[model samples]
Target: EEFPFALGVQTLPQTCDEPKAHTSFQISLSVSYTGSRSASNMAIVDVKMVSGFIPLKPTVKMLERSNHVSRTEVSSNHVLIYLDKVSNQTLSLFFTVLQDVPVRDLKPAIVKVYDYYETDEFAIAEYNAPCSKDLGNA
Candidate 1:
C-alpha cells in the first residue's frame, strides 16, 4: 500500500493597503489514499503565523473530521486557528501535514493576508532608584 497527500491554502483578500489585527484564520486540507486492497488514511494539521522571522503557534480548533477513508476514498479536514489579536500588516501563514496509511506522504502550503490595525495607542515608562547606605557596615 502507498499514501498520497496534498495541501492547499487561501486568503480572503489577495491584496491589502491597510494592516489590521487578525482575530482568527481558517485553513482547509484535502488528502487522498491510494494503494493496496486495505484502506489506510490519516490526517495531521498544523497552523502557524510568521511574525518578522519568528513563527508563532496559532491556537487551532478542529471544526470537523471525516470517518476513516479507504484506498479508494478521499478525506478532508478543516482547521480554524485563532490569533492573539489582529495583525498590523500582511502576515504569512503556514500549514503542514503527514499521512501514514496505505502509503506515507508529506504536504505543505503557505498563504498571506493583509491585516489592518485594530487600534492606535502608545506608552512609555521610566524608573529611578534612591541612594542607599550600609548602616550595618558603618
Candidate 2:
C-alpha cells in the first residue's frame, strides 16, 4: 500500500495445504504498474532457494503470460526474466521437484517486479509452504 507497483504470486497444486513430495506445481505471477514517474529497464525476477522446487521446461495449461520476455535465464538458484518495460502484464513459470524429507520452515520463494536498479523500487510476493513425506513412499 506504500509503493507504485503491485504484484502477486499464485502457486498451483497448492503447496501449503498439506502438499506431498514428488508432486508437481507451478507459480503464477500478476503485475500492475501505476507509477506517476517514469520507470526504465523494468524486469521481473523469481527465486527458489532452500525449497523443494525443481526446475522444469517452460509452458503449461495453467501457465501463460501476456508480456514479451527478452531473455530468460534458468539458473540453479532462480529464474531471471528480462524485459524492456512494465505495462501491466502477467506471467507464470513452471517447475516441479521431489522433496522427500519433512519440509518445515522453508525459505522464501518470491515473485519480484522492479525497476532496473536505478531507483531500486520493487514489489515482492511471498511463496512459501510445508510438504509432508509422501504417503506413497519416503
Candidate 3:
C-alpha cells in the first residue's frame, strides 16, 4: 500500500570517498518509479541541504540537454524540480559545490519525491559525504 519508487545520489571524480575538504564537486541525484497502477500525473522533487547549502549557485540543471522537467526553483538551502508527468521512470539532476571552511556540522542532502496531486505517494533519499578517519598523520 505504499508508493513504489526509489532514489539515489552519486559524487564524481572528486567523489566523496571520504569526508575530506574540497573546493567543489558535482553531485548527481537519481529518481525512479515502479508501480503497477496508473502513471503519475506529475512529480515534485525536493532537496534540502541540512546544516548548510554550498554557495556555488542559486540553481541547478538536468544533465541532459532536453527532458520532461517543467519547472525548477532554487534557493540558499532548497532546490525544487518538477516534472509534468511520470513514466515509471528514472532521471538525473546535477549541482556543483563550492565550500570554504564550513563551520557547521557535516550534513547530508535529503531529497524527496511526491505526487503533485496525491498525498500518499512519495519517495525519500539521502546524499551524504563519506566519513573521515582522524588518525595520527604526523
Best by lDDT: 3
| Global lDDT of each candidate | 0.23, 0.49, 0.56
TM-score of 2: 0.58
User: Which has the better TM-score: candidate 2, or candidate 3?
Assistant: 3
- Runs with alpha carbons beyond 4 Å of true place in candidate 2: 1-3, 14-21, 39-41, 57-71, 85-111, 130-138
Candidate order (TM-score): 3, 2, 1
Find the 10 residues in a row with the least total lDDT in model 2: 59-68
Write model 2 residue lDDT over 1-138, tens digit each, in one string. 335666655655564445442465544444445554544435565555435445543532213243444444455446555445445443334444434444445465655765545464667766654343345433
Model 3 alpha-carbon miss at residue 94, Å: 1.3
Per-model TM-score versus the true fold: 0.27, 0.58, 0.64
lDDT of 2: 0.49
lDDT of 3 by residue, 24-118 (tens): 55555556655556755555677775425364454353322245355555565666665554574666567665555455566666778765445
Q: What is the lDDT for 67 in model 2?
A: 43
Clashing pairs in 3: none
Decide which is better by TM-score, 1 or 3.
3
Clashing pairs in 2: none
Assess candidate 1 and give its lDDT. 0.23
Off by over 4 Å in 3: 1-3, 16-21, 50-53, 58-71, 131-138
